């Protein structure tokens, strides 16, 4: 499969999440995603084909994971935006007030701004600390997806937010949305990963 930020993948033929970013670990291919999407050694499938397994994750506390892929997978420096793509250029962290977009299989590509950093989400499983909050909307299924500036600087992976009964927070005004993402830089250093760029 071609590995692109924002596309769907299933975990153990049950849950769905979105790919965050193509990364390498030496000769090994992978993509980073959210920790709550799978446990270590769970099977990832894209289009009904096995592409790799969860290699490591931390959830709750943090919310991060990387999936190691078989070598038949094609890593690409891109994030889906409808039929078009945003090139991943690096991972400079943007400040509060910066505009940012995110990509996932449920709501597609949505943009907004970063409103706060170092937010704690108190999920049923336990707290996840150190999350950045943006007000781009998102929905169930978007977890693990890319947050990136249009200049191609990769920001993080979707963790969670304030869902309404329709399964997303797109029908409530931006001022009222809390869409939380896990910062990419600590995931890269923690697992020794390098971002694929173009």
């Amino acid at each position: 499969a071609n590995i692109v930020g924002g596309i769907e993948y299933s975990i153990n033929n049950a849950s769905l999440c979105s790919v965050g970013f193509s990364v390498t670990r030496g000769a090994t291919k992978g993509f980073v995603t959210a920790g709550h999407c799978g446990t270590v050694n769970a099977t990832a499938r894209i289009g009904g084909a096995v592409v790799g397994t969860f290699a490591a994750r931390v959830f709750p506390g943090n919310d991060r994971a990387w999936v190691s892929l078989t070598s038949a997978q094609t890593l690409l420096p891109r994030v889906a935006n409808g039929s078009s793509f945003v090139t991943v250029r690096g991972s400079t962290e943007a400040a509060v007030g910066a505009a940012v977009c995110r990509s996932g299989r449920t709501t597609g590509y949505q943009c907004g701004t970063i409103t706060a950093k170092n937010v704690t989400a108190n999920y049923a499983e336990g707290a996840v600390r150190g999350l950045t909050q943006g007000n781009a909307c998102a929905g169930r299924g978007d977890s693990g997806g890319s947050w990136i500036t249009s200049a191609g600087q990769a920001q993080g992976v979707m963790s969670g937010g304030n869902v309404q009964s329709n399964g997303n927070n797109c029908g409530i005004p931006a001022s009222q949305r809390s869409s939380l993402f896990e910062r990419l830089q600590p995931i890269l250093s923690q697992y020794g990963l390098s971002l694929v760029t173009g």
Binding site: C17, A34, H36, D63, A121, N122, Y123, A124, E125, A138, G139, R140, G141, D142, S143, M158, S159, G160, G161, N162, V163, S178, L180
Partner: peptide, 4 residues
């Protein structure tokens, strides 16, 4: 908030 909930995960996603």
């Amino acid at each position: 908030a909930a995960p996603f």
